[PDB]
Design an enzyme around this catalytic site. Structure first.
Site, mmCIF file in Angstrom:
data_model
loop_
_atom_site.group_PDB
_atom_site.id
_atom_site.type_symbol
_atom_site.label_atom_id
_atom_site.label_comp_id
_atom_site.label_asym_id
_atom_site.label_seq_id
_atom_site.Cartn_x
_atom_site.Cartn_y
_atom_site.Cartn_z
ATOM 1 N N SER C 140 -45.646 36.899 -45.789
ATOM 2 C CA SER C 140 -44.513 35.935 -45.433
ATOM 3 C C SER C 140 -43.158 36.553 -46.101
ATOM 4 O O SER C 140 -43.315 37.084 -47.351
ATOM 5 C CB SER C 140 -44.574 34.624 -46.078
ATOM 6 O OG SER C 140 -43.614 33.820 -46.256
ATOM 7 N N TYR C 153 -47.162 29.171 -52.731
ATOM 8 C CA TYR C 153 -47.392 30.024 -51.499
ATOM 9 C C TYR C 153 -46.805 31.376 -51.485
ATOM 10 O O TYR C 153 -47.473 32.253 -51.157
ATOM 11 C CB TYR C 153 -46.565 28.957 -50.256
ATOM 12 C CG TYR C 153 -46.742 29.918 -49.112
ATOM 13 C CD1 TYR C 153 -47.727 29.721 -48.044
ATOM 14 C CD2 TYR C 153 -45.392 30.603 -48.601
ATOM 15 C CE1 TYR C 153 -47.485 30.025 -46.897
ATOM 16 C CE2 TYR C 153 -45.267 31.040 -47.488
ATOM 17 C CZ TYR C 153 -46.318 31.006 -46.285
ATOM 18 O OH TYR C 153 -46.201 31.685 -45.155
#
Ligand SMILES: NC(=O)c1ccc[n+]([C@@H]2O[C@H](COP(=O)([O-])OP(=O)(O)OC[C@H]3O[C@@H](n4cnc5c(N)ncnc54)[C@H](O)[C@@H]3O)[C@@H](O)[C@H]2O)c1
Ligand SMILES: NC(=O)c1ccc[n+]([C@@H]2O[C@H](COP(=O)([O-])OP(=O)(O)OC[C@H]3O[C@@H](n4cnc5c(N)ncnc54)[C@H](O)[C@@H]3O)[C@@H](O)[C@H]2O)c1
Ligand SMILES: NC(=O)c1ccc[n+]([C@@H]2O[C@H](COP(=O)([O-])OP(=O)(O)OC[C@H]3O[C@@H](n4cnc5c(N)ncnc54)[C@H](O)[C@@H]3O)[C@@H](O)[C@H]2O)c1
Ligand SMILES: NC(=O)c1ccc[n+]([C@@H]2O[C@H](COP(=O)([O-])OP(=O)(O)OC[C@H]3O[C@@H](n4cnc5c(N)ncnc54)[C@H](O)[C@@H]3O)[C@@H](O)[C@H]2O)c1
Ligand SMILES: Cc1ncc2c(c1O)C(=O)OC2
Ligand SMILES: Cc1ncc2c(c1O)C(=O)OC2
Ligand SMILES: Cc1ncc2c(c1O)C(=O)OC2
Ligand SMILES: Cc1ncc2c(c1O)C(=O)OC2
Lengths: 247, 247, 247, 247
Positions: C140, C153
């Site tokens: 990401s 995350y």
């Protein structure tokens, strides 16, 4: 205390802005500081403001003869630099469609090639004097952000980072380290007088901490990089921007 | 320096190696230092080696209850930490085909999750005490190099860098900065007792500067990051490895 | 249009979103594609939707027994994978003060540890067959940006990048490459159903290119990484975000 | 047919080495390819090696007049480029103490300033023609590694990366992407004739995968970046070096 006592540091572009602040801090650290700038009158005033430990010597970093004269004078007065801070640069605001070859060449010649000219002479001087040394070059976090209205400048600053990384490899054997600092937007004399002054809103929005960056924010990091506390750091780039980007 | 006079710093994993050296330097800087380690005997020895500015308080960073007790005792003694150094970790030497789930979970649990546990509690403590604060986490330059025989460890250290970047965003509003240091190979107590000790020849040959990295090389950089000189730096990773890689 | 003929690719989390788009493109490229998801009905539907050589096998990537069963069935159906795409993850929206140990453990367990579990089994399966395979993990761009409301995350995704870099070193000798992709904000099924959907305005304004990112933007890059055109790339991270950040 | 059917790609420095390989691959993809090199006869010979889809046009990328004439001819032949590959450069082997100002200026003038000159004219041509475009510039993984014996070159290639990042921001509104490739050491015509040919032992030792890098390894990645599969990638640098460094 006064960790730089007995050391000599050259700061280019030190008549104003970040360069003046760096020179002031290194002087407070105890160094003999050479305040150099293409603006001779500005250099004189900056050195006078700093006091005592500071001496002004004018030079145009893009002019090899000017730089040779600068270093000859430093050698005569001090025996050679221990610390080099490559701070001088033009900081333009130029729309992409106004970036022509004349502009490009000027920015590269001063910001990138001038940095080479000064570093070549300065590190040769360190070596000739048998000095462990520190090269610290001021780049820019625009290299990470891809900031608009500065295309030639971002290229030149990427060149300074590349040069730094290669230089670290070349000079390590001489006990000379070479690192770069990437400031974010700083409220320097030059920025206040340019359209970048209008960028603080956007930049502060992206910062993790609020406030306008100040020349002292950069000077205090350069102090660390000039110190023995940074002796194991070479070839690295330290980003100083309250978190606008993450390096 | 005494620049940290009146400040409290917690260093985890400070019984030996890099953590002990970090603790020693922060105490020299003037801080009250909490030397914490899962090895209680070692923490006591390390605090004793540093002197009256250091206090040993044992904790397992992967155990939330142990960490709660640690911070409760720090709060009672000092009013809360100003500086957190996340240094504790397991440093494994494990061939890829020996990296099974049990090993993976253990390294992740201590090195990454333990770092969260301590940071959660520590930054909550700073905030409750209305303290500007500094979080400094020790990662590893293996994250840049992709060093072999440490797969779960490299993952965990990448996690620490990611965590640091997000944390800088989350805590900037509370005047807390979050940075990471990536040491290269360091001749710590732990490395000397492991097969990593045999990596020094290859690493030194790849370094720009000569010599084996020492705990003090890292401690002195953490000193800077704990100081006001680093006040404009947040979300960043500073690589300290004599030039083995370039960041 | 058939460069992956004869190859078998596993895509986790492929019931919807980026995962399904990846599976669809690899099938169009000619591969036998194993569509795997913890949503068993969803995996079946997506495999049937793709047609071609797609087959569904449900699995929870965080459950080692489930993954063991997954790879046994793949081995029996196809003779083993050539290509592994680690796409499954939980994408949370959680305020920092709501990031507790339970939340952290879950995100790390699925997103990071699940990636290890699948990669352990999948690359072992590649090696058992002697195949010069491909590991591609979806990370990401929040790792670069330090995006808020995702602290565990971002840590997990940094772990995936670290793991990737180490894995490239470990598996290069078996001619298996390991790379990562960092998508920016993408208009996936999952994002449309989350508060992250509201980030599109800000994100598009920071992008260099116009538009909302689509799952096919990522699928088409993964196609390249799975192909022989990427044969000399290993240990690298490719950022795919219309220029929100620069890597 | 043929992803690039109807497209026109200019590749500079395409008489030999990586540039020739790129031109060959883009032709295989279906593009009309302009093979440009300062070596006029070399450019003709390379176009002939490619066939009916290639046209040779000589140009010195460091010479504005030569570059403008190049693009004037391209406009008449094809209506203007869709794709620009900035591949021309001098690849020197020069000990640090032999890096003087004359050498520095030559390397920067060709490798960095020439890249600007070509990109200025090329992207202006794309825009005048109303063409979505792709700019792909060949840098070097020496920017990441700080490779010795190439100091000006590393600086110039860092400049190309900086330029790429800024250019992506400037040109996104015109639907033009700008990316960079950093090859590792490649067994090109030019390297085979230089002292870099002796570096394969050391470079392969550091690579995750073994073997000498080949021009096709780079050409095949440039093919991807020129294609629609890379449409969501801009401002990025893709490192292609069998894992010598990790980006
Ligand atoms: N201010 C910022 O937001 C910012 C951000 C990132 C990086 N930087 C970098 O910090 C450094 C200082 O920037 P500043 O904002 O203080 O600039 P400034 O404009 O305030 O001062 C620059 C100084 O450099 C001198 N100079 C210009 N060309 C010279 C040359 N040819 N030879 C010798 N001196 C020369 C000028 O006379 C001036 O005194 C520069 O390298 C700049 O690129 C600044
Ligand atoms: N030494 C190196 O080459 C090197 C290189 C890069 C990064 N690092 C990092 O530097 C830090 C210190 O490394 P070192 O070489 O000094 O380690 P070391 O092995 O010498 O000491 C580590 C200390 O951490 C403690 N510890 C382990 N698990 C703990 C837990 N669950 N709770 C509390 N304490 C725990 C140990 O008891 C030990 O005292 C680590 O984060 C390591 O990953 C080390
Ligand atoms: N969409 C974005 O903006 C974005 C941005 C950057 C990265 N990513 C990454 O892309 C990947 C896909 O994201 P998406 O937006 O398409 O997600 P999504 O929510 O639309 O779909 C994710 C799929 O993974 C499955 N899944 C969840 N937990 C699982 C587990 N334990 N085992 C097996 N499957 C499981 C779900 O059932 C679902 O089908 C993820 O790795 C995500 O982190 C997404
Ligand atoms: N070969 C490698 O190991 C390697 C590694 C990293 C990056 N690169 C980069 O790849 C690109 C190609 O390298 P190569 O090894 O194939 O080079 P090469 O020496 O084999 O060929 C370079 C070509 O560029 C041409 N050229 C030189 N100056 C020119 C100018 N002023 N104007 C127009 N053409 C000019 C030459 O005539 C020659 O045909 C270069 O950008 C180089 O920096 C190469
Ligand atoms: C983020 C940012 N904005 C504006 C400017 C710079 C910068 O780094 C810079 O170096 O000069 C002007
Ligand atoms: C380069 C390097 N070599 C060995 C080791 C590390 C490292 O960074 C490390 O962190 O633990 C062992
Ligand atoms: C930039 C950005 N914004 C929101 C999200 C992500 C991201 O990368 C992500 O991976 O999940 C949500
Ligand atoms: C790793 C490496 N070694 C030698 C060379 C390069 C390089 O990237 C290069 O671009 O030109 C010569």
């Amino acid at each position: 205390t006064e960790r730089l006592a007995g050391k000599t540091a050259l700061v280019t572009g030190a008549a104003q802005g970040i360069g003046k602040a760096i020179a002031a801090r290194l002087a407070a650290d105890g160094a003999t500081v050479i305040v150099s700038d293409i603006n001779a009158e500005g250099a004189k005033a900056a050195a006078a403001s700093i006091g005592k430990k500071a001496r002004a010597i004018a030079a145009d970093i893009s002019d090899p003869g000017s730089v040779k004269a600068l270093f000859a004078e430093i050698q005569a007065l001090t025996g050679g630099i221990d610390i080099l801070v490559n701070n001088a640069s033009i900081v333009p605001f130029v729309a992409w469609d106004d970036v022509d070859l004349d502009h490009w060449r000027k920015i590269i010649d001063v910001n990138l090639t001038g940095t080479f000219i000064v570093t070549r002479a300065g590190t040769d001087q360190m070596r000739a004097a048998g000095k462990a040394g520190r090269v610290i070059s001021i780049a820019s976090n625009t290299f990470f952000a891809g900031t608009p209205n500065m295309a030639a400048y971002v290229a030149a600053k990427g060149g300074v980072i590349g040069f730094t990384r290669a230089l670290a490899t070349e000079l390590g054997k001489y006990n000379i380290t070479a690192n770069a600092v990437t400031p974010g937007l700083i409220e320097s004399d030059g920025v206040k007088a340019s359209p970048h002054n209008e960028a603080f809103g956007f930049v502060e929005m992206l910062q993790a901490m609020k406030g306008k960056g100040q020349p002292e924010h950069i000077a205090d990091v350069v102090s660390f990089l000039a110190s023995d506390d940074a002796r194991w750091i070479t070839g690295q780039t330290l980003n100083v921007d309250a978190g606008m980007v993450r390096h």
